[PDB]
Design a protein around this ligand. Sequence first.
Ligand SMILES: Nc1nc2c(ncn2[C@@H]2O[C@H](COP(=O)(O)OP(=O)(O)OP(=O)(O)O)[C@@H](O)[C@H]2O)c(=O)[nH]1
Ligand SMILES: Nc1ncnc2c1ncn2[C@@H]1O[C@H](COP(=O)(O)OP(=O)(O)CP(=O)(O)O)[C@@H](O)[C@H]1O
Ligand SMILES: Nc1nc2c(ncn2[C@@H]2O[C@H](COP(=O)(O)OP(=O)(O)O)[C@@H](O)[C@H]2O)c(=O)[nH]1
Ligand SMILES: O=C(COC(F)F)N1CCCC2(CC2)C1
Ligand SMILES: [Ca+2]
Ligand SMILES: [Ca+2]
Ligand SMILES: [Ca+2]
Ligand SMILES: [Mg+2]
Ligand SMILES: [Mg+2]
Ligand SMILES: [Mg+2]
Lengths: 425, 438, 54, 348
Amino acid sequence: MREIVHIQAGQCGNQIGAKFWEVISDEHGIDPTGSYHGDSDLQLERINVYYNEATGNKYVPRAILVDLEPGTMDSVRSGPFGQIFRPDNFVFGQSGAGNNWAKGHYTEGAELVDSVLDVVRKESESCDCLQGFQLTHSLGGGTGSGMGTLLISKIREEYPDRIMNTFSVMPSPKVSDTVVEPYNATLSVHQLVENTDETYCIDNEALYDICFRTLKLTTPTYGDLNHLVSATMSGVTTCLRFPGQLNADLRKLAVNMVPFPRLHFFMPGFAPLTSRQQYRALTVPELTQQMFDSKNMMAACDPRHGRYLTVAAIFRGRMSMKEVDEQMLNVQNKNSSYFVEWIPNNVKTAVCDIPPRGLKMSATFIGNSTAIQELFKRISEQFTAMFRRKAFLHWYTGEGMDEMEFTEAESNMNDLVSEYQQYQD
Amino acid sequence: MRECISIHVGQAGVQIGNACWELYCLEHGIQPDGQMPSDKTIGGGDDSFNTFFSETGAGKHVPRAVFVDLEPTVIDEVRTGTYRQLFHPEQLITGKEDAANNYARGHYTIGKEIIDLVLDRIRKLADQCTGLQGFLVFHSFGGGTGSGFTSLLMERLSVDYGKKSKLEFSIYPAPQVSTAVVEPYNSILTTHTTLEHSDCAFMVDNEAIYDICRRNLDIERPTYTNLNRLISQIVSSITASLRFDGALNVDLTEFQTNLVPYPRIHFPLATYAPVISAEKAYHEQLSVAEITNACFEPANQMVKCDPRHGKYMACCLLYRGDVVPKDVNAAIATIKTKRSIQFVDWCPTGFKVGINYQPPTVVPGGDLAKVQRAVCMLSNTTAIAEAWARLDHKFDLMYAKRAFVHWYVGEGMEEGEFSEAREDMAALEKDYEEVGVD
Amino acid sequence: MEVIELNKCTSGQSFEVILKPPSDPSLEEIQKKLEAAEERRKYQEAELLKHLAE
Amino acid sequence: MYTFVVRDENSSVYAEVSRLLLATGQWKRLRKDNPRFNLMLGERNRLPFGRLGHEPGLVQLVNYYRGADKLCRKASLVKLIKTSPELSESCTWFPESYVIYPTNLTDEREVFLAAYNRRREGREGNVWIAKSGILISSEASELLDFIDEQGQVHVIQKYLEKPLLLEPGHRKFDIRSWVLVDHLYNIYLYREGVLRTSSEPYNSANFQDKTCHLTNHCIQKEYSKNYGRYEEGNEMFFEEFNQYLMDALNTTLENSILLQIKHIIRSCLMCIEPAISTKHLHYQSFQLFGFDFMVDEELKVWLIEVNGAPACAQKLYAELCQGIVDVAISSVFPLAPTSIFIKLHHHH
Ligand SMILES: Nc1nc2c(ncn2[C@@H]2O[C@H](COP(=O)(O)OP(=O)(O)OP(=O)(O)O)[C@@H](O)[C@H]2O)c(=O)[nH]1
Ligand SMILES: Nc1ncnc2c1ncn2[C@@H]1O[C@H](COP(=O)(O)OP(=O)(O)CP(=O)(O)O)[C@@H](O)[C@H]1O
Ligand SMILES: Nc1nc2c(ncn2[C@@H]2O[C@H](COP(=O)(O)OP(=O)(O)O)[C@@H](O)[C@H]2O)c(=O)[nH]1
Ligand SMILES: O=C(COC(F)F)N1CCCC2(CC2)C1
Ligand SMILES: [Ca+2]
Ligand SMILES: [Ca+2]
Ligand SMILES: [Ca+2]
Ligand SMILES: [Mg+2]
Ligand SMILES: [Mg+2]
Ligand SMILES: [Mg+2]
């Protein structure tokens, strides 16, 4: 009974989190009304990790929906599985955040945060042994970014010894809402560096290029991007939601993936990613070659530009586990120049007999690569291009911030990049 | 008759313990309900099996065992398993959240709060003993509980039972069946703080058990059940003398006498044979000399090393089945004339031999085939130091970068305890080279 | 090649073969170590809460 | 894609093998500390055998047999021959030898003096050579006093006083034979041997000048004045040495010398096979050996020493090195003749 409390904040946070619960709810046999209708007891074995059990055998997600405007959450409640979420778990305001980190963190957000902690405390008080929290949000907006990181800061104060995990969508000018996204992203990254144990970095540019080039989607939408994150989120959490000789709790995964407290930002990956030649059976070598290929990486970073500190791959479906080990040991022993030699056996593999819906077998990739520094390098350059001219700063100074706080975020991330550099040589 | 209290710490210890007592029951003729038809003395008796089993007035034979894990998933299997009736609920101790492979967590953070409860439950078994010999501690090197909480229990056992002996059955970390990257740290930490508290330690390297399962049992990807059913065969061979009538290794003290001439060098290598796949229609049964000859093949050693390039300090041959002393000496003679068995000049060049006529018991539905005769060789070679070398090297590669050290320091451990632990292993590796090399 | 101390019983026998002659921390000390690390945890957590309070 | 590491930058031999490996476009070299390797061209001293064969999914192969030092050491060989029943103390192809520890440190001093005094009284040639810095002398007092001056273990053995001298020149020589033992413990002998001949006339009335007595390529090239006269680099190859044996002695190199060399290589290597074999081992071993033989005026072959890290003749680096890749490395890691070796079959 190692429960996980889920929180989704903001537009991106809630639209992605919605599809996430849609995906795993299907994998566990939970219909849109919370009733179970699966056929394998493996579905219910660890069902209580993400769901509570109400009366009548009803399973209610352990999720807290947060946003500073009603719009996004209203859609979810009216969406496919909107009826499955606890009504009290909807915590929202009306002003909105205006894609302003200061509004989500200091002004609007501060007014609503105490009431979100009221629901978090209520979900925790029902847990037999809380593993920790997981947040899904974007960093370029104002609520998921500004108020999300304010939520983590306060959740880590009331639960200093619980694991704090985040799925964080990183902004990209190619997939942009506003020009202030680097400002918000740089301000959140420093918060995550301090108050998260694991952050899964998800770059919207990678999600977009995968949809255009690999999935062959002429005109990708936000929905299209959210499909990939949904599938990925289901993949990384497979070693949590199902039984296996792993016995992996959030803290155990952190202990074996994070060799240094600040370098806890991961690159996820998924395979296959087929275009509609979609029924063809994918072999184990093919799953492996793709899972480690950059075109299947969702951080928009070339691993061949850095070195892997640790790597964790999960294989789903009925397949030769022997053949699995063979191909994994072939990937490492064919490109050992990209794995650090000072962490013995830093590549681990888990297998799962239950594949995702509609796939005979897949593989989810979780890599702590020093190549992630290229991402923060992008954000830092876009941040400095505007900040040197103080462009758009008035939005933030008007909310109570000072330029000094921006300079600090600037440095605190450049330091982060520098830390990733030394461990890469 | 003197009693032996077995202690199982962590997942590896608990599951291995489950596999052994399953075997002890099949061997001693005990049913899952604790009933023993052959035991004519009901609810009492000072027989050789009573060293591991007590008896209730209702005729139940209850293991003298304690299961401890900082997380309840593994031990919940014992509570509802086949032999759930053997133990009473007091024998099974479980926690809420485990140690997350963090030695500092199982020893300090979490161990400090549960140590006094485990000792209390053990004291309940001691109070049923008329002359408690010692303890048999089963644990893993890599686990945060098995490594971190074990070393704390050992320190406290040396305090509450100063004159009692303590043997170990330790699982050496093998990448092929592990997802932990920090297992080298834990191993070197638990060996340092446990070294002066364990009188004799049998190390089993999963890498060795893994290949023995793939090679002999034709198992392409062995599970823990396979690895454990085999380890409880070796453990059975090493504990049989304490559970059966005999004269060799009749008490836990004899293990330190016959196998450990030097205190720190208390890690005998174990070799077992034959391991035959049951799926083989019918196997030609091996002779006393062939199974004894196998005891010097690196293939069936519990730790892969080259004993030829070491020096034996002691040597025990434990036979089970159709073996008479004549055959043993015949094989030994031929083996000395063909094998490279270099002893230390300050130790006799000899072999102690134990024979039990009951052949190895096989678990119905298991992997091992029923053989007419088998043997387990307990030899104390400097060659086992190869294991410490591999491990100490992996420790050095990570520690040079302080990788993962923040997790240990975060749980209250000082960074100095790392180097202090490492420096002890630098001394341990030195004691082995001084005794073997010229 | 010698055999010494041959003991026989109903369930087996044991003997020796010589091929060639030769040529703690008190209970108080542990409580301190345990509590010492507990104090270093409380100090580390204090500096965390002090950080968050700022 | 096979991978290997290099941990002996001085090995002229395997330096070539490593060069040929990369030439195949199928062998990738890794850092010397990268444990994910297939082939280890390991260091000479203190090679970490205990760390081999423990990488999941890697079949690892190394270029040194653990334990072969018993055969490639001055004192160890003497002990191995005197104690091993397969070689016995009456071995007829190894000069009488004795292990002599310096007095400032079992030891065979008295056992040596007994044979010495016997030879002195028997009017027989009593000239011995001490080594481990080499001394030749006929007075036992000088040989022992020299070892005591040193601090390391020395070995005193009979100096072949009737060595076969090549004409013209009247000059001493030795024969180097390279021998490769693969993982399956086959014994392959290189068809090309070299004679490191002395360019000075052998003089039996003066062991002080160790120039015509020590056929070492460095001594003839440093303290000899006729270096490179009769043959280039004081190195005569089997072709020439064979033609000489026929013209002068009316015999072949095969019948008069090679049969004994092939018999000495077998007896030595087979003797230690049970101690160093990697048949049922978690890793695999192979090694290149350099045997040094002496030939007397009776055409009898004697074993001087065995080199564990031998160098090759400048003219035979390409042929032998590639051959080391064919039967030693590629036999375990094949790539997607007329062998240049002579298999010495034996009972395993
Ligand atoms: N032979 C064998 N090894 C096991 C078994 N279970 C776990 N291991 C090994 O134990 C090591 C990890 O230690 P665990 O026993 O799982 O850890 P723990 O003692 O439960 O402590 P925690 O970290 O708190 O969970 C790994 O190297 C595993 O290969 C088992 O049943 N048999
Ligand atoms: N017992 C003996 N009888 C005759 N000559 C001898 C001898 N012992 C040594 N030599 C001479 O010494 C040379 C070999 O010396 P040795 O091999 O012992 O030293 P070393 O090992 O440093 C040279 P290498 O490179 O061949 O190993 C030969 O050329 C030989 O002529
Ligand atoms: N992958 C994905 N990214 C989104 C989605 N919606 C917005 N984003 C990204 O998130 C950033 C905008 O933040 P947003 O969540 O809309 O602001 P917030 O509601 O105040 O937190 C931009 O960089 C967008 O590219 C979505 O549905 N999917
Ligand atoms: O506060 C900001 C600044 O956003 C900027 F930081 F990205 N808003 C944007 C303009 C509309 C608004 C109501 C005033 C909200
Ligand atoms: Ca307001
Ligand atoms: Ca009884
Ligand atoms: Ca003690
Ligand atoms: Mg938006
Ligand atoms: Mg555990
Ligand atoms: Mg030499």
